[PDB]
Amino acid sequence: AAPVTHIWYFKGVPSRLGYLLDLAPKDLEKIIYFAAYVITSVDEEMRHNELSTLEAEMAVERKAVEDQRDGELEARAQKLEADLAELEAEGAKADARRKVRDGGEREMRQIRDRAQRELDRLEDIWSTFTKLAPKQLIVDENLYRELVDRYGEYFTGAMGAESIQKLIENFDIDAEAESLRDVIRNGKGQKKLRALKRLKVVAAFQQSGNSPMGMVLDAVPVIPPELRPMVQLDGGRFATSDLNDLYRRVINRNNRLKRLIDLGAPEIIVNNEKRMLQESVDALFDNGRRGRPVTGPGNRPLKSLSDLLKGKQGRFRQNLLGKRVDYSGRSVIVVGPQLKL
Amino acid sequence: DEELTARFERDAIPLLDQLYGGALRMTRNPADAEDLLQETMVKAYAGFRSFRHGTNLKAWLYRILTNTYINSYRRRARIRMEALPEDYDRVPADEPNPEQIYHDARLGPDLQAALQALPEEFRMAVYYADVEGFPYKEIAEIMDTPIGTVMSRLHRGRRQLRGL
Amino acid sequence: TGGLPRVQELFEARVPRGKAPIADVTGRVRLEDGERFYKITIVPDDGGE
RNA sequence: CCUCGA
DNA sequence: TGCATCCGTGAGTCGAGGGT
DNA sequence: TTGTGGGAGCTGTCACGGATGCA
């Protein structure tokens, strides 16, 4: 129902997506698992042809906040002066009088600091919108909700693997490849080594005609049933490979996501379900690679598709480089000295 | 009503985090508690208009999760599902062996009874009506003979082979 | 180092523990004696640095 | 998986 | 932007029997 | 589906290399 990243190309060190898009792996972790929004596209001409009007409206909003702050502060200051005059009219202990004065000054400081926090949030919003660009992360939910409430139609932002798919769509690989070649050729240092590392994968995707979009999936293949056997045990019991339970979890989560989509569910619940779908596909492919592994009965991790190949028990060591054979036997040896060599 | 969906995210989403710790106390499996908590949210959002505002939503949602777990327990624990042995290569195929499929595809010593003792009219019609299981009109087509010939050579070839 | 660990250290071409550096070029040696650590400088005989 | 054999 | 840290590799072969 | 209700179970492993992440 929603695209999913192949955990091999996200969590497999080094993050192949983290090199392709030049994103940090922790930022990729935030984007794919619905912790942070990312800016997929920014409308340059529309932001430039309306910057004057938006800045004007912004300045008026800030002036309004400042005028309200000054009104509140003046009201409180007159109130405090009147109260201290009332106390000075009667017998007023100097220390309790200064307690009242300090309470008033604290209230004023709180008014001013509240107004200043609001003005700082406004400044942050404006400076962020003026410096919007693709591949940028908005980690604050409030900041993104503001940046879409205002200026909403000037850009696009998204979470999850759908946004990574979009970033790969709007990605010009030849441009970044030639940029990295120029950086490597006309420079040196640690940035040179990082650029060589990135150029490895970028040129691998470029020279071959393999689309990088393959790193995100919209459908998952299902291995034939004979390779994930289900056998009837003694009685009503049954036995299955772990692959079947992983496929069952992926299926159930995709179905629940479809239900939530059709039901017009809150964005929070649907994002939870998309995150769970991504995590279950990651378990099906390489369990335990990110976070804790998925466990069956008895806290035992489930053998993933990748486990089938790895280790001495994997297909390579256990079924291809060596096999059990026919026309063969075994027995205890005894010494026969009467034998010939 | 769009006022009900905003009524949901307002005062019931902070409960969603405290319910995860509750569903975990019941399923003892994080992958299962998440499926249970989401299934509770689907069941509560579809019938949110059935909740009366102002009253306790936390006690309402918690009883939804408790009931959908008792149902989900008896629904899926009706069939005991456990794991294969640690090596999957010891799960036996249930096919016949090369020796077993050789002696089972051939025929016994009677293969010379139906070959020589019966006429080729009975031999060819009986061998293709029982082994192949062709329709009565398909065996009519192979030998250019009607039902009167095919159905007869079969009835008589069986009584022929009843001997020996 | 030891036995089989040293064999693995060599076959893997790992930088050995207890490294003994070698000379880059023919020259005159100057070894400064120090209680805690040593230090060496080589002045090449080929007109080098 | 456990216990054991070389 | 220069490393220290953290994370992810790898760690003998073949046998018997009993279990989930 | 109303009035309460957040988990198991682990570390007693070792050596090495290079991406990551922070100062």
UniProtKB/Swiss-Prot annotation, chain A:
Belongs to the RNA polymerase beta' chain family. The RNAP catalytic core consists of 2 alpha, 1 beta, 1 beta' and 1 omega subunit. When a sigma factor is associated with the core the holoenzyme is formed, which can initiate transcription. This is DNA-directed RNA polymerase subunit beta'. The chain holds residues 98 to 438 of 1316 of the full protein. Transmembrane segments: none annotated. DNA-dependent RNA polymerase catalyzes the transcription of DNA into RNA using the four ribonucleoside triphosphates as substrates. Induction: 6-fold repressed by starvation.
UniProtKB/Swiss-Prot annotation, chain B:
Keywords: DNA-binding, Phosphoprotein, Sigma factor, Stress response, Transcription, Transcription regulation. Residues 136-155 bind DNA. A motif (Polymerase core binding) lies at residues 35-38. Residues 16-74 are annotated as: Sigma-70 factor domain-2. Residues 114-161 are annotated as: Sigma-70 factor domain-4. Transmembrane segments: none annotated. Changing T5A: No in vitro phosphorylation by PknB. Coiled coil: none annotated. It comes from the Bacteria. Induction: Poorly expressed in exponential phase; induced by heat shock (20-fold, 45 degrees Celsius). Induced 10-fold by the thiol-oxidative agent diamide within 30 minutes of exposure, by 2 hours expression is again normal. Autoregulates its own expression, part of the sigH-rshA operon. GO terms for cellular component: peptidoglycan-based cell wall. Disruption phenotype: Increased susceptibility to oxidative stress (H(2)O(2), cumene hydroperoxide and diamide, PubMed:12123450) and heat shock (45 and 52 degrees Celsius). Loss of stress-induced expression of a number of genes including clpB, dnaK, sigE and trxB, sigB and itself. No effect on infection of human derived macrophages, and murine J774.1 activated and unactivated macrophages. GO terms for molecular function: DNA binding; sigma factor activity. Phosphorylated, possibly on 2 residues, probably by PknB. Phosphorylation of SigH has no effect on interaction with RshA. GO terms for biological process: cellular response to heat; DNA-templated transcription initiation; regulation of DNA-templated transcription; response to heat; response to nitrosative stress; response to oxidative stress. Sigma factors are initiation factors that promote the attachment of RNA polymerase to specific initiation sites and are then released. Extracytoplasmic function (ECF) sigma factors are held in an inactive form by a cognate anti-sigma factor (RshA) until released. This sigma factor is involved in heat shock and oxidative stress responses; it positively regulates the expression of itself, sigE, sigB and a number of transcriptional regulators as well as other effectors of heat and oxidative stress, leading to direct and indirect control of up to 25% of the bacterial genome. Was identified as a high-confidence drug target. The sigma-70 factor domain-2 mediates sequence-specific interaction with the -10 element in promoter DNA, and plays an important role in melting the double-stranded DNA and the formation of the transcription bubble. The sigma-70 factor domain-2 mediates interaction with the RNA polymerase subunits RpoB and RpoC. The sigma-70 factor domain-4 contains a helix-turn-helix (H-T-H) motif that mediates interaction with the -35 element in promoter DNA. The domain also mediates interaction with the RNA polymerase subunit RpoA. Interactions between sigma-70 factor domain-4 and anti-sigma factors prevents interaction of sigma factors with the RNA polymerase catalytic core.
